[PDB]
């Protein structure tokens, strides 16, 4: 969300 | 850790086998007429949280023989459990020793030394080195339980496992180190390509001066199928005492015993094998005064690199 | 003797009362249960044998310190944070709880009865020092003067408003409750034990975490000696007109010193930490020590 | 909603204590693993050869209970930064012993104090244990907002308390934490157990802790006020700090004895629940962003990539 | 289990 | 290697100092009247290619005293040189022993043990551990040459050296390991920021039971300049016997002695230091039964990470 | 030299 992708 | 010892203790078969082996040994060492005068000195070498100490006491009760027990353990955390058991239940019959069996200055010699220092490949937890150091406190006619153990190897095919090892590449180490180390694994999606063959054997007590626990074995495996070789499954068998044994070799697997899953020695590059060809593998057991390791290579139908030279990817600390 | 079947391994305290009966304090600092017990031995030579006590009682938590309150009362510094008062029955066969007041927020490490015998001082790991009224079973005052654990509190032998305290904050404080700011700082290594001189009103001795014993006079330079190789656990003056000074340590020894702090007697009888020492009121040359090795040793001191 | 624990330094019977604590409504117990008064010797005879068990058995609780309900506490006598060489050596050996027992038990967390400026050797011994075996456990550094030396009663005649503002001086405990974590090279297993006092310091001291890995907030019973009904409550300023800590989802720890004697013990925990229930409900944005707090993401690239 | 540790 | 021993041997000062120390010791131990009856047992512990054996014989000739020599060396390659010297020149007066001094079952006790097991930071080649193991064969009134050694540290500034360490990043290891290990370096383009202060001391024979060669030192360095801290220069001094010493400490450097260049302990991140500030450094000497290592940290004016925790980047094998 | 090995 909030213009982001990926992460964990 | 506490839970590791708790998992060990969940295996009912293993300890009932140790109890049967101690029971038979006590009967062979003390004749009925010496029942009330002969006190056998029993040392549990690597006592953990106390199941082999309890197995020894149950064995002495069922044999109707007298025992004097020492429970030797180097892990001080497990020593807490042992010392709480000693005060609350065991009493004076058990002497808990917080020491490495290789350093302990025993105050008396033993009639029987009992240990369970076995890995999935038998000698991979360093049972030979540990029992070699403890040997000097066993009497001249003394018995070691286990008396013997043998590792076994079998070639396997598993593109599933090959890919599983492949994905174990980590930062800050050799990009191929994951292929130069064994894994304990409950092998499932795989093909055993030839019957397991014996690799390395150790006998206790060891009466071949200067021992030499280093070893070199060549194994030739007939293969009746077209396949791809990805590694070697490792298993073991152990003679606790006479006919009382434990085994994880599939063909002679002790029923209901789950303490050990097989070991897997991978190879870096998969090897195509045609029906009727022979897989020739070479295995070495190496050491210095600090570490023990395995090195391995395939030499037929094609050569592989020697895996784990000088223990560069995998070592077993002494 | 209508008491617990077995006393705990770790003997913490030993105190003779006027008639020569011996009061013991013990805790189990290991094993399943971490509690304590209180014992009276009218025959001190039978100690620590349970079947030969006059009275014994189980406490809920460990005994970190204790003291007599007159001839029949026993004040206990507990692990629970409570200061407890126990009392010998008229038959002296039972030890009955009079009060258990949970006022400290951590272990109560030290306890000391003031001159009157109607009030006491407690020190704790909670950094507070409390003044108690023993009859009303209440805290009269609570002081947070120190900046670390209170190691030892010692009531003046003859001045009911004066006491000493020391702590891990490296302070030795002289208290006089008649003052608006009641504490005053007395001028290296952490102080660990305190003992007022029984004859010289403004003189006291202190032991430190490095084995040193020091002689101090409120007025003024200090006389000192390296008596022990480790922490000075306790300091107890003898009952003689010219007292001897017993010192005990985590180095498992007992030393008996003179006026100039020179050694006269040394004992290595204990196999673990020496925790308390008490001089017999009947035979002045007999000093009794207790330790974590579960030994009650009766020393014959050359006087 | 609120995850809370009990802090004790006296546990006579492990099973009985856990039961009493669970009945009170607590989710965990911070407790000593070795008796806090049981000082041990590792170097000098005869005391180094002390027999019997060094502590309570691991068999007293199930593996699940050790893994989820027990937070270990370092013994108070363990002083790795002591000026005395002998204490320093015995403390290093005892600290390694206690941390290794905690890891043996599978404790989810272990509490260590930061109660003075120099904790260099404590950091060295901790860093060494971290680079030895099982890398799962959390270390909670118990550090106060206000150092005991700075909140002592002004009762020492020849040592008055400083009535002057010392801007950086009042932020001292943050530098204790900062230096400690710098020494341990920002290990993610090292977090803060922030201890709250009866009187809060200036806002700048409180804000100094913003952006810090606070996993727990320690509330002594002695900081609680009493209401007309006789039940424990907190000052408006303390409540303001509780609300900030609730947004960080810290675990609250209740330490000390019951000071509201004729009002039961779970009352302290009932008050925290009250504050937790009586907080502003999250807005449309806050309800949407729940789960994404401090979650790093790659910025979308709708030109180079097809969404 | 089966004499192993780690993995995931 | 042969050439390494050849470089050692090129230092004329070092051996002439050892000879003077042995010469004085022999005179102090044997009075003139006992000249022809008293044979001193001298053991050269870590004999290399034989210069200290030759230094001992020259010392005995100039003292006009009788010696019985043992040359102990664990390196079998150097043992070849020693055994060829023994047959061709030395004779029966010298007994060459191919052994580790920690394992050797000496047949006689020594009057003097002579060794040169010193690194640039004194104890970094493990002279304390080696001489501790050899201690049991030295007589009760026996002398060890060297009798004592002390390491020294001094803060330094060198953006040149910082960049030199930075460029030592290698594949398959921690990307910052190069900053967690010492380097032997002839320091040239640098600024010494405060006077060298003593770090660790060892005395032989060691009469503090259970020894404990582990150490912890805090050093506070006054700095009178604006600068940038990049690491610590390490040096040492040694008392061979009484007033006969060797030193690489700049202020007391033994003239013309080039056997040791200083050591450098870098720091990962440069530290700004203002005039009048104090650099506080912490150094630890750590070990297990297998390895010895150093750990270090700066705590003032700012904290650094602890460098080399548990010997993760650098260890000295036992 | 000076008790060192390697480098370049
Ligand atoms: N050299 C040694 N000296 C003493 N204990 C050792 C040594 N090497 C391994 N051990 C211990 O012996 C052990 C054995 C285990 N493999 C089995 C544990 C236990 N007997 C059980 O069957 O439940 C572990 O507890 C180790 O800590
Ligand atoms: N534990 C040991 N036992 C025997 N020799 C050792 C041991 N440790 C080191 N050495 C040897 O002693 C040595 C010493 C050198 N640092 C100096 C060599 C020689 N004495 C010279 O000054 O030219 C090397 O030759 C090592 O092989």
What is the distance in A from the centroid of ligand 2 to the CA of B126? 32
Nearest residue on chain G to F260, judged by CA atoms? G2
Instruction: Tell whether residue B101 is among the known ligand binding residues.
Output: yes
Distance CA B127, CA B44 (A): 13
F295 in ligand 2 pocket by Cβ < 6 Å?
A: no
- Same domain for F136 and F193: no
Nearest residue on chain B to C30, judged by CA atoms? B84
B130 in ligand 1 pocket by Cβ < 6 Å?
A: yes
Other beta carbons within 10 Å of D274: 12
- Please name the residues between 23 and 82 in chain D that touch chain B, using a CB distance below 8 Å: 52-59, 63, 66
* B81 contact D CB<8A: yes
Q: What is the largest CA-CA distance in chain E?
A: 16
DSSP result, chain C = --S-SS--SEEEEEEE-TTS-EEEEEE--SSS---EEEEEESSGGGTT-GGG-SEEEEESS-EEEEEEETTTEEEEEETTSEEEEEEE-TTSS-EEEEEEEE--SS-EEEEEE-TTSSEEEEEETTS-EEEEETTTTEEEEEE---SS-EEEEEE-SS-TTEEEEEETTS-EEEEETTSSS-EEE---PPEEEEEE-SS-TTEEEEEETTSEEEEEES----EEEE--SS-EEEEEE-SSSS--EEEEETTS-EEEE-TT--EEEEE---SS-EEEEEE-SSSTTEEEEEETTS-EEEEE---
| Chain D residues lying within 8 Å of F212, measured CB to CB | 43, 89
Ligand nearest to the CA of residue F129, numbered in listed order? 2
Q: Do F310 and D128 touch (CB under 8 A)?
A: yes
F116 as an active site residue: the answer is yes
- Same domain for F298 and F196: yes
| Chain C residues lying within 8 Å of D59, measured CB to CB | none
The answer to whether residues C263 and C253 touch, using CB atoms and an 8 Å cutoff, is no
- Same domain for F55 and F167: no
Q: Do F173 and B172 touch (CB under 8 A)?
A: yes
Looking at ligand 1, which residue's alpha carbon is closest to its atom 6?
Answer: B46
- Select from B172, B173, B290 the Cβ nearest to the Cβ of F290: B290
Distance CA D82, CA D97 (A): 18
CATH superfamily of C1-303: YVTN repeat-like/Quinoprotein amine dehydrogenase (2.130.10.10)
Token pair listed for F269 = 């991140």
Domain finish residue from F105, F128, F147: F147
Q: Kindly list the distances between the CA atom of residue F220 and the CA atoms of D9, D301, D305, F154, F214, in Å, as whole numbers in the listed order.
A: 38, 53, 57, 10, 21
What is the distance in A from the centroid of ligand 2 to the CA of F47? 6
Looking at ligand 2, which residue's alpha carbon is closest to its atom 10?
Answer: F46
DSSP code at position F146? S
The answer to whether residues C179 and C161 touch, using CB atoms and an 8 Å cutoff, is no
- Same domain for F212 and F176: yes
What is the distance in A from the centroid of ligand 2 to the CA of B194? 52
The answer to whether residues C166 and C172 touch, using CB atoms and an 8 Å cutoff, is yes
The answer to whether residues C192 and C152 touch, using CB atoms and an 8 Å cutoff, is yes
| Chain F residues lying within 8 Å of D118, measured CB to CB | 299
Distance CA B91, CA B110 (A): 19
Active-site pick, F125, F148, F164, F176:
F125
- Same domain for F138 and F17: yes
Instruction: Tell whether residue F101 is among the known ligand binding residues.
Output: yes
Token pair listed for D291 = 């789960």
B117 in ligand 1 pocket by Cβ < 6 Å?
A: yes
For testing the chain G interface, which of F184, F187, F256, F263 should be mutated: the one with the most G CBs within 10 Å? F184
CATH number for the domain that contains residue B308 = 2.70.160.11
B170 as an active site residue: the answer is no
The answer to whether residues C161 and C181 touch, using CB atoms and an 8 Å cutoff, is no
The answer to whether residues D159 and D149 touch, using CB atoms and an 8 Å cutoff, is no
Distance CA D196, CA B308 (A): 55
- Same domain for B165 and B20: no
Counting Cβ atoms within 10 Å, is residue C174 exposed (0-12), middle (13-18) or buried (19+)? Answer: buried
What is the distance in A from the centroid of ligand 1 to the CA of B100? 9
Nearest residue on chain B to D103, judged by CA atoms? B1
**Chain F residues near any Cβ of chain B (below 8 Å):** 172-175, 290
Token pair listed for D103 = 């890891």
Other beta carbons within 10 Å of C301: 18
What is the distance in A from the centroid of ligand 1 to the CA of B1? 12
Looking at ligand 2, which residue's alpha carbon is closest to its atom 16?
Answer: F117
Domain finish residue from F83, F114, F147: F147
The answer to whether residues F280 and F258 touch, using CB atoms and an 8 Å cutoff, is no
What is the distance in A from the centroid of ligand 1 to the CA of B6? 13
Looking at ligand 1, which residue's alpha carbon is closest to its atom 22?
Answer: B116
Distance CA C235, CA C162 (A): 19
Which value, to the nearest 10 degrees, does the dihedral of the CA atoms of residues F216, F222, F227, F228 take? 10
The answer to whether residues B236 and B122 touch, using CB atoms and an 8 Å cutoff, is yes
Phi-psi sector, F242: left (phi>0), alpha (psi -120 to 50), beta: left
The answer to whether residues C179 and C189 touch, using CB atoms and an 8 Å cutoff, is no
Token pair listed for D77 = 């006598």
Which structural technique was applied?
X-ray
- Same domain for B183 and B56: no
F131 in ligand 2 pocket by Cβ < 6 Å?
A: no
Q: Report the SS3 class of residue D113.
A: strand
- Same domain for F106 and F35: yes
B204 in ligand 1 pocket by Cβ < 6 Å?
A: no
What is the distance in A from the centroid of ligand 2 to the CA of D2? 65
Active-site pick, F116, F180, F237, F295:
F116
- Same domain for B143 and B154: no
- Please name the residues between 74 and 103 in chain B that touch chain C, using a CB distance below 8 Å: 84, 87-88
DSSP code at position D288? H
Distance CA C104, CA D82 (A): 26
- Same domain for B159 and B127: no
DSSP result, D151-215 = H--S-BTTS----S--TTGGGHHHHHHHHHHHHTTT-TTEEEEEEPPSS---HHHHHTTTTS-EE
Looking at ligand 1, which residue's alpha carbon is closest to its atom 17?
Answer: B116
Counting Cβ atoms within 10 Å, is residue F170 exposed (0-12), middle (13-18) or buried (19+)? Answer: exposed
B231 in ligand 1 pocket by Cβ < 6 Å?
A: no
Listed in sequence order, the DSSP H helices in B12-119 are 12-29, 51-63, 76-85
Domain finish residue from B117, B147, B177: B147
Distance CA B25, CA D299 (A): 71
- Same domain for F111 and F65: yes
Counting Cβ atoms within 10 Å, is residue F196 exposed (0-12), middle (13-18) or buried (19+)? Answer: buried
In chain B, the number of structural domains is 2
The residues, any chain, with a CB within 8 Å of residue C73's CB and separated by 6 or more, are C85, C86, C87, C88, C98, C134
- Same domain for B140 and B13: yes
Nearest residue on chain D to F216, judged by CA atoms? D121
CATH number for the domain that contains residue B93 = 3.40.50.150
B237 in ligand 1 pocket by Cβ < 6 Å?
A: no
Q: Do chains F and E touch (3 or more CB pairs under 8 A)?
A: no
Query: What is the span of the domain harbouring residue B305?
Result: 148-318
Write down which chains contact chain E via at least 3 CB pairs under 8 A: B
The answer to whether residues D94 and D32 touch, using CB atoms and an 8 Å cutoff, is no
The residues, any chain, with a CB within 8 Å of residue D191's CB and separated by 6 or more, are D138, D139, D140, D141, D213, D214, D215, D216
Ligand nearest to the CA of residue B49, numbered in listed order? 1
Rounded (10°) angle between helices D172-183 and D120-130:
40
Q: What is the largest CA-CA distance in chain D?
A: 76
What are the residues facing B292 on neighbouring strands?
B287, B316
* E3 contact B CB<8A: yes
Distance CA F139, CA F264 (A): 38
Query: What is the span of the domain harbouring residue D255?
Result: 1-287
Looking at ligand 2, which residue's alpha carbon is closest to its atom 9?
Answer: F46
Active-site pick, B9, B125, B164, B176:
B125
Write down which chains contact chain F via at least 3 CB pairs under 8 A: B, D, G
For testing the chain A interface, which of D300, D304, D305, D307 should be mutated: the one with the most A CBs within 10 Å? D300
Distance CA C61, CA D102 (A): 23
B60 in ligand 1 pocket by Cβ < 6 Å?
A: no
B138 in ligand 1 pocket by Cβ < 6 Å?
A: no
Which value, to the nearest 10 degrees, does the dihedral of the CA atoms of residues F84, F90, F94, F100 take? -30
CATH number for the domain that contains residue D265 = 3.20.20.150
* F280 contact D CB<8A: no
**In ligand 1, which atom is closest to the CA atom of B101?**
3
């Amino acid at each position: 969300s909030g213009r982001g992708k990926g992460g964990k | 850790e506490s839970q590791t010892y708790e998992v060990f203790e969940k295996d009912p078969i293993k300890y009932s086998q140790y109890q049967q082996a101690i029971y038979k040994c006590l009967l062979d060492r003390v004749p009925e007429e010496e029942k009330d005068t002969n006190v056998q000195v029993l040392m549990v070498l690597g006592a953990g949280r106390g199941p082999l100490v309890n197995a020894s006491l149950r064995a002495a009760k069922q044999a109707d023989r007298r025992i004097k027990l020492y429970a030797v353990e180097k892990n001080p955390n497990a020593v807490v459990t042992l010392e709480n058991w000693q005060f609350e239940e065991w009493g004076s019959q058990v002497t808990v020793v917080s020491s490495d069996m290789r350093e302990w200055v025993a105050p008396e010699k033993a009639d029987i030394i009992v240990s369970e220092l076995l890995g999935s490949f038998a000698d991979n937890e360093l049972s030979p080195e540990c029992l070699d150091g403890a040997q000097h406190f066993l009497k001249d006619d003394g018995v070691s339980i286990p008396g013997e153990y043998t590792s076994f190897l079998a070639p396997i095919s598993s593109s599933k496992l090959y890919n599983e090892v492949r994905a174990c590449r980590e930062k800050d180490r050799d990009p191929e180190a994951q292929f130069e180390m064994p894994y304990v694994v409950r092998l499932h999606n795989f093909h055993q390509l030839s019957a397991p063959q014996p690799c390395f054997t150790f006998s206790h007590p060891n009466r071949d001066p200067m021992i030499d626990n280093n070893r070199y074995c060549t194994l030739e495996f007939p293969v009746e199928v077209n396949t791809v070789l990805h590694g070697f499954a490792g298993y073991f068998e152990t003679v606790l005492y006479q006919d009382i044994t434990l085994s994880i070799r599939p063909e002679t697997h002790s029923p209901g015993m789950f303490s050990w899953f097989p070991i897997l020695f991978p190879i870096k590059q998969p090897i195509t094998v045609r029906e009727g060809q022979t897989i020739c593998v070479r295995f070495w057991r190496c050491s210095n005064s600090k570490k023990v390791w395995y090195e391995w290579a395939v030499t037929a139908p094609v050569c592989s690199a020697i895996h784990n030279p000088t223990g560069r990817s995998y070592t077993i600390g002494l | 003797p209508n008491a617990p079947a077995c006393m705990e391994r770790q003997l913490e305290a030993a105190r003779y009362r006027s008639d020569g009966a011996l009061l013991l304090g013990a805790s189990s600092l290991s094993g399943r249960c971490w509690a304590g017990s209180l014992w009276l031995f009218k025959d001190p030579c039978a100690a620590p044998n349970e079947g030969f006590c006059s009275a014994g009682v189980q406490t809920e938590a460990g005994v970190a310190d204790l003291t007599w309150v007159g001839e029949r009362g026993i004040l206990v510094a507990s692990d629970s944070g409570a200061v407890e008062l126990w009392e010998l029955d008229e038959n002296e066969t039972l030890i009955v709880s009079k009060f258990c007041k949970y006022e400290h927020d951590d272990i109560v490490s030290t306890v000391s009865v003031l001159s009157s015998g109607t009030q006491a001082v407690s020190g704790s790991k909670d950094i507070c020092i409390k003044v108690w009224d023993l009859a009303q079973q209440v805290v009269l005052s609570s002081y947070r003067a120190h900046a670390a654990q209170v190691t030892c509190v010692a009531a003046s032998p003859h001045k009911d408003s004066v006491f000493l305290s020391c702590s891990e904050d490296n302070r030795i404080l002289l208290w006089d409750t008649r003052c608006p700011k009641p504490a005053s700082q007395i001028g290296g290594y952490l102080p660990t034990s305190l003992a007022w001189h029984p004859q010289q009103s403004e003189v006291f001795v202190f032991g430190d975490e490095n084995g040193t014993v020091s002689l101090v006079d409120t007025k003024s330079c200090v006389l000192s000696s390296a008596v022990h190789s480790q922490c000075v656990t306790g300091l107890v003056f003898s009952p003689h007109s010219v007292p001897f000074l017993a010192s005990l340590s985590e180095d498992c020894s007992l030393a008996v010193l003179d006026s100039s702090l020179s050694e006269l007697f040394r004992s290595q009888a204990h196999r673990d930490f020496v925790r308390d020492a008490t001089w017999s009121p009947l035979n002045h040359s007999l000093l009794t020590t207790v330790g974590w090795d579960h030994q009650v040793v009766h020393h014959v001191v050359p006087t | 909603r609120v995850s809370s624990g009990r802090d004790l330094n006296c546990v006579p019977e492990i099973a009985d204590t856990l039961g009493a604590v669970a009945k009170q409504g607590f989710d965990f117990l911070c407790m000593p693993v070795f008796h806090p008064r049981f000082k041990r010797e590792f170097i000098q005879e005869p005391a180094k050869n002390r027999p019997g068990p060094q502590t309570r058995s691991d068999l007293l609780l199930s593996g699940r209970d050790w893994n989820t309900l027990i937070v270990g506490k370092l013994s108070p006598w363990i002083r790795p930064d002591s000026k005395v060489e002998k204490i320093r050596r015995n403390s290093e050996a005892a600290m390694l012993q206690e941390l290794n027992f905690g890891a043996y038990l599978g404790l989810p967390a272990f509490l260590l104090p930061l109660n003075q400026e120099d904790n260099t050797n404590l950091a060295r011994v901790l860093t060494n244990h971290i680079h030895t075996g099982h890398h799962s456990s959390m270390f909670w550094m118990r550090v106060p907002l206000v150092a005991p030396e700075d909140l002592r009663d002004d009762i020492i005649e020849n040592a008055p308390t400083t009535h002057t503002e010392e801007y950086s001086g009042e932020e001292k405990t943050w530098m204790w934490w900062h230096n400690f974590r710098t020494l341990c090279d920002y290990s993610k297993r090292i977090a803060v157990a922030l201890e709250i006092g009866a009187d809060l310091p200036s806002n700048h001291v409180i804000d100094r802790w913003l952006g810090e890995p606070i996993k727990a907030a320690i509330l002594p019973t002695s900081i609680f006020l009493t209401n007309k009904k006789g039940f424990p409550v907190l000052s408006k300023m303390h409540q303001r700090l509780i609300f900030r800590l609730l947004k960080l989802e810290v675990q609250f720890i209740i330490t000390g004895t019951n000071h509201h004697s004729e009002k039961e013990f779970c009352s302290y925990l009932q008050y925290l629940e009250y504050l937790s229930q009586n907080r502003p409900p999250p807005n449309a944005y806050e309800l949407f962003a729940k789960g994404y707090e401090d979650y790093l993401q790659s910025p979308l690239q709708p030109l180079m990539d097809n969404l």
